Amino acid sequence: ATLNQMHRLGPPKRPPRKLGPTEGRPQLKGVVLCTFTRKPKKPNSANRKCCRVRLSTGREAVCFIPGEGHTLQEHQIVLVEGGRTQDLPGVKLTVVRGKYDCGHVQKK
Amino acid sequence: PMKGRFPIRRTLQYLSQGNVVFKDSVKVMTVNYNTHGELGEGARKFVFFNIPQIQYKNPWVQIMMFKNMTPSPFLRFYLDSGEQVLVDVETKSNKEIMEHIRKILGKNEETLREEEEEKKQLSHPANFGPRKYCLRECICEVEGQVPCPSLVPLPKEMRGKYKA
Amino acid sequence: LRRKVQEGRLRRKQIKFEKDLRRIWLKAGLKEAPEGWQTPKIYLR
RNA sequence: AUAGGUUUGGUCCUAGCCUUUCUAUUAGCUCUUAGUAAGAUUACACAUGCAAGCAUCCCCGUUCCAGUGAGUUCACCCUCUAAAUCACCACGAUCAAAAGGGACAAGCAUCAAGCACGCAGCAAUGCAGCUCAAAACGCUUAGCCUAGCCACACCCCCACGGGAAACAGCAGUGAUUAACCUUUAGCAAUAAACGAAAGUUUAACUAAGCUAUACUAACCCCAGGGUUGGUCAAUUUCGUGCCAGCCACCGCGGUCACACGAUUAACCCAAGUCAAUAGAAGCCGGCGUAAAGAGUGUUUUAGAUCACAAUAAAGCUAAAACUCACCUGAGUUGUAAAAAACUCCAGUUGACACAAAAUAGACUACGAAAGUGGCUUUAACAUAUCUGAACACACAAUAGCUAAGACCCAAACUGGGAUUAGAUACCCCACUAUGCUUAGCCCUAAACCUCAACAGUUAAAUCAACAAAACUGCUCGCCAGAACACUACGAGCCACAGCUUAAAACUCAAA
RNA sequence: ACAUUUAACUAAAACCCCUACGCAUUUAUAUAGAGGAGACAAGUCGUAGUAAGUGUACUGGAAAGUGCACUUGGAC
Numbered sequence: 001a002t003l004n005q006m007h008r009l010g011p012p013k014r015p016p017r018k019l020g021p022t023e024g025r026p027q028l029k030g031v032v033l034c035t036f037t038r039k040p041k042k043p044n045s046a047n048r049k050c051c052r053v054r055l056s057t058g059r060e061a062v063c064f065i066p067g068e069g070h071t072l073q074e075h076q077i078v079l080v081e082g083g084r085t086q087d088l089p090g091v092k093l094t095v096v097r098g099k100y101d102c103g104h105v106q107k108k
Numbered sequence: 109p110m111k112g113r114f115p116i117r118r119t120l121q122y123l124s125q126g127n128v129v130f131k132d133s134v135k136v137m138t139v140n141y142n143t144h145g146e147l148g149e150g151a152r153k154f155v156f157f158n159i160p161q162i163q164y165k166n167p168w169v170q171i172m173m174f175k176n177m178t179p180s181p182f183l184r185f186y187l188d189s190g191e192q193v194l195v196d197v198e199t200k201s202n203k204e205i206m207e208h209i210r211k212i213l214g215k216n217e218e219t220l221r222e223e224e225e226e227k228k229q230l231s232h233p234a235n236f237g238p239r240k241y242c243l244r245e246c247i248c249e250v251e252g253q254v255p256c257p258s259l260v261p262l263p264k265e266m267r268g269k270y271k272a
Numbered sequence: 273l274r275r276k277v278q279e280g281r282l283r284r285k286q287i288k289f290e291k292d293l294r295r296i297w298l299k300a301g302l303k304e305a306p307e308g309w310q311t312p313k314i315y316l317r
Numbered sequence: 318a319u320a321g322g323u324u325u326g327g328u329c330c331u332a333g334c335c336u337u338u339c340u341a342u343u344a345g346c347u348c349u350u351a352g353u354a355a356g357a358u359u360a361c362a363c364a365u366g367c368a369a370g371c372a373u374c375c376c377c378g379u380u381c382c383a384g385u386g387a388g389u390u391c392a393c394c395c396u397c398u399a400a401a402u403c404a405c406c407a408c409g410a411u412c413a414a415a416a417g418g419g420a421c422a423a424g425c426a427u428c429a430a431g432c433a434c435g436c437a438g439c440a441a442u443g444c445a446g447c448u449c450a451a452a453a454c455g456c457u458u459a460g461c462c463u464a465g466c467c468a469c470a471c472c473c474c475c476a477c478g479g480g481a482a483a484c485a486g487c488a489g490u491g492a493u494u495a496a497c498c499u500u501u502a503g504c505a506a507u508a509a510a511c512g513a514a515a516g517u518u519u520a521a522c523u524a525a526g527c528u529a530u531a532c533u534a535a536c537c538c539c540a541g542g543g544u545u546g547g548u549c550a551a552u553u554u555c556g557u558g559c560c561a562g563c564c565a566c567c568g569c570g571g572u573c574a575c576a577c578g579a580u581u582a583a584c585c586c587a588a589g590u591c592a593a594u595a596g597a598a599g600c601c602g603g604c605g606u607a608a609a610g611a612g613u614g615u616u617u618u619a620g621a622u623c624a625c626a627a628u629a630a631a632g633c634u635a636a637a638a639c640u641c642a643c644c645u646g647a648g649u650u651g652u653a654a655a656a657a658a659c660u661c662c663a664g665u666u667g668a669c670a671c672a673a674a675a676u677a678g679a680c681u682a683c684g685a686a687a688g689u690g691g692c693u694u695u696a697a698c699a700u701a702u703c704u705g706a707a708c709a710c711a712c713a714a715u716a717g718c719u720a721a722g723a724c725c726c727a728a729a730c731u732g733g734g735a736u737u738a739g740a741u742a743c744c745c746c747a748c749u750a751u752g753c754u755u756a757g758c759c760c761u762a763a764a765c766c767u768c769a770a771c772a773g774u775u776a777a778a779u780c781a782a783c784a785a786a787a788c789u790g791c792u793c794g795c796c797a798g799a800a801c802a803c804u805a806c807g808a809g810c811c812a813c814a815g816c817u818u819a820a821a822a823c824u825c826a827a828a
Numbered sequence: 829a830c831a832u833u834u835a836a837c838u839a840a841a842a843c844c845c846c847u848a849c850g851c852a853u854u855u856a857u858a859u860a861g862a863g864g865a866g867a868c869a870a871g872u873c874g875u876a877g878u879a880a881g882u883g884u885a886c887u888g889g890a891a892a893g894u895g896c897a898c899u900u901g902g903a904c
């Protein structure tokens with residue numbers, strides 16, 4: 001582009017950054033609606049422990065439960081952080097272990 | 109690389125190399141020059157190289173350019189009193205034009221030095237305040253004075269917790 | 273079905289155009305439209 | 318950025334994503350002492366106690382300080398000039414409103430027109446003007462340019478009036494949020510108010526309380542968190558066996574797992590660690606083939622320095638068809654071979670187009686492009702700087718659509734003949750729209766030399782590759798991962814499932 | 829819509845208007861129904877001639893084809 005065209009267009013206008021599943025917040029409180037398991041996309045195979053939660057914003061979202069063994073039931077309160085589960089398409093929220101009802105993974 | 113011919117012209121160093129600071133009387137400067145013709149060649153360079161520097165040093169002075177309206181290139185300065193100053197620049201080099209306009213309507217070096225000295229007085233070294241305005245924030249930074257409690261805890265005797 | 277949707281949209285466009293035209297003379301102070309004014313149907317052949 | 322990982326069987330190029338760095342908040346786990354700084358998520362609702370008095374009565378102050386960030390170009394400069402302080406006989410300085418002039422955030426042009434937004438006159442009134450693609454008008458977002466400033470003070474912009482009964486003063490509470498400080502003391506210092514003054518008052522402030530949020534310093538005993546496949550510093554033994562599980566990207570896990578779990582050891586940082594989130598750091602690069610030169614030309618406001626085969630008209634026709642007529646024959650057409658069809662058929666001869674224009678042309682011309690190749694004639698092929706538009710002004714092959722006309726031949730469709738074992742869509746016959754003329758539409762092409770227009774150079778290392786040797790100056794147009802998408806919506810169009818302009822969400826680590 | 833009174837050997841008193849908002853207007857949310865995009869799903873799931881194209885228009889013996897023009901990013 002010529003100098004006249006650069007002057008006319010002006011400085012580059014970076015588009016506003018996209019808000020993620022947490023809406024630009026570190027964590028979100030949620031109420032567990034139902035628990036289930038999902039299968040990975042294929043290079044892999046597993047039964048990934050997931051749960052659907054209604055977030056404090058009111059939206060329902062699917063979240064992954066990390067670690068070996070969880071005791072989440074309906075109506076329980078959890079804290080969900082960001083970070084995609086690479087194996088599960090569309091699962092962009094993760095439950096925080098050791099907060100509210102979701103306890104730490106039991107030793108061994 | 110930087111676009112255009114002579115990209116040095118679009119650097120703040122080059123723009124600040126200008127040596128013409130007009131007196132407060134000069135309000136408008138019209139530059140009538142010819143795109144072609146050897147006799148106005150220097151005038152063309154004056155437009156190409158020196159008008160940016162003049163404008164940078166004189167932001168509030170209206171500079172306007174005109175092309176191929178008269179047989180010869182010239183400059184006209186309009187003053188606050190209504191007086192007009194005409195400077196014929198045909199057959200002159202751009203350096204000659206710069207030197208001439210500096211001589212006839214430019215502040216001399218003595219006046220500029222006086223202005224700089226007047227500026228210096230504003231930033232009094234003894235004043236304490238933000239770095240943006242002052243050399244020091246607080247007298248605690250002066251050697252020999254009682255230091256800041258952030259770095260050197262004050263002795264128990266001069267602190268209110270142990271004076272109460 | 274796209275004909276019905278399209279003609280409904282054209283009707284809504286005509287209604288919007290008439291509403292804006294009305295807004296103008298209402299704001300200007302005229303209680304009614306300019307004497308002898310009639311909004312043409314520009315979005316229908 | 319001193320960069321690095323990742324597309325492929327492989328190389329090169331282009332291009333996105335991610336890593337390494339520095340801060341802030343929150344979460345997990347873990348936390349010893351001292352000094353300092355800082356400290357609700359919410360303009361939601363607030364129990365309780367305090368936060369404005371002073372003073373011989375008048376006045377003065379409570380319009381300040383303190384708080385919040387809801388709204389949002391009221392803050393800055395100049396002119397003029399109130400109120401205020403001091404001169405206080407004013408001369409005038411300082412400070413600073415109202416008014417006039419100028420300046421002043423971000424995103425969206427799919428917000429492109431606003432609709433009275435100007436001028437002249439003492440007025441009556443006259444003129445028809447004013448803003449705007451150099452962004453008017455409009456929608457959305459946000460306190461700002463921080464010795465501080467602006468705005469607000471429960472809401473109705475405002476507060477006569479109404480809702481209704483107000484902590485966005487300090488401490489404190491409820492609800493809410495990922496977000497969580499004491500219902501301390503004193504006016505001893507400074508500041509403010511008042512007083513002639515000694516002085517009085519002040520949740521400003523000062524001195525304390527709480528909190529790893531941060532900085533500084535320490536510690537006799539006292540170390541935790543994360544990590545160990547590569548990027549990237551650092552794994553022994555077992556357990557499990559595509560399960561359980563793990564990863565920021567690439568990826569690991571199917572009986573020898575340095576990648577999961579435990580354990581050992583090691584690495585980094587350390588009273589912290591680092592999981593999530595949010596910032597810090599972005600186009601002087603490109604457009605034949607990767608995204609990008611959008612079919613052609615002109616000009617505006619501006620910027621730059623380079624100052625014979627065109628097209629419209631009229632006429633005309635040499636071959637070959639069709640049709641008509643005589644003479645002759647019984648067959649003609651059709652193909653790999655046939656059947657249908659025709660026999661008002663066929664051969665010679667003569668007459669005879671609103672159709673198409675052998676040879677020349679092995680030429681390479683004309684025209685802006687699209688296009689233009691039978692003959693004659695009449696008009697006729699812009700501009701003595703260059704650039705200059707999806708939209709302005711004029712054009713745009715073929716196909717397609719309105720009205721009329723012509724019809725030899727060709728021919729989408731439509732019928733019929735012939736064909737395997739679901740025939741030939743394909744071959745044969747007949748015949749439409751259409752190909753032609755006249756007056757209007759439609760506005761698309763592999764509209765391509767897949768090379769934007771002008772001016773210049775051949776010296777350099779020629780140069781990613783291929784294409785078509787490599788470049789320079791200047792201008793306009795256009796492009797910033799893939800797909801969604803030659804799409805949806807908006808807008809415009811003689812177009813009506815048509816054309817032009819042209820997104821977003823979800824998804825992926827590539828393409 | 830609406831109006832100059834008292835007073836005046838020092839000087840003063842007195843002063844107060846009524847009308848709006850709607851079947852108007854802007855944007856947004858919710859609801860019947862309809863339609864797209866992506867997801868090449870995971871396997872103790874299955875298997876031994878007519879050159880290319882770009883525009884258009886048509887197709888009722890359509891596993892693709894045809895008509896007209898154009899391109900070589902084909903062959904000779």
Ligand code: FES
Nearest residue numbers: 246248255256257
């Ligand atoms: S800054 Fe001066 S004592 Fe702290």
Ligand SMILES: [K+]
Nearest residue numbers: 371372377511
């Ligand atoms: K007083």
Ligand SMILES: [K+]
Nearest residue numbers: 386387388460
């Ligand atoms: K604000």
Ligand SMILES: [K+]
Nearest residue numbers: 388469474475
């Ligand atoms: K308000």
Ligand SMILES: [K+]
Nearest residue numbers: 504505506507
């Ligand atoms: K005091």
Ligand SMILES: [K+]
Nearest residue numbers: 763765767899
């Ligand atoms: K071509």
Ligand SMILES: [Mg+2]
Nearest residue numbers: 322323332333
């Ligand atoms: Mg890369």
Ligand SMILES: [Mg+2]
Nearest residue numbers: 323324325326
């Ligand atoms: Mg590979």
Ligand SMILES: [Mg+2]
Nearest residue numbers: 344345529590
């Ligand atoms: Mg922490």
Ligand SMILES: [Mg+2]
Nearest residue numbers: 398399400401
């Ligand atoms: Mg005064």
Ligand SMILES: [Mg+2]
Nearest residue numbers: 391414415416
């Ligand atoms: Mg003012």
Ligand SMILES: [Mg+2]
Nearest residue numbers: 427806807820
């Ligand atoms: Mg739109």
Ligand SMILES: [Mg+2]
Nearest residue numbers: 426450452708
């Ligand atoms: Mg534009």
Ligand SMILES: [Mg+2]
Nearest residue numbers: 386387459460
């Ligand atoms: Mg705000």
Ligand SMILES: [Mg+2]
Nearest residue numbers: 469470475476
């Ligand atoms: Mg108010």
Ligand SMILES: [Mg+2]
Nearest residue numbers: 484487488489
């Ligand atoms: Mg409070």
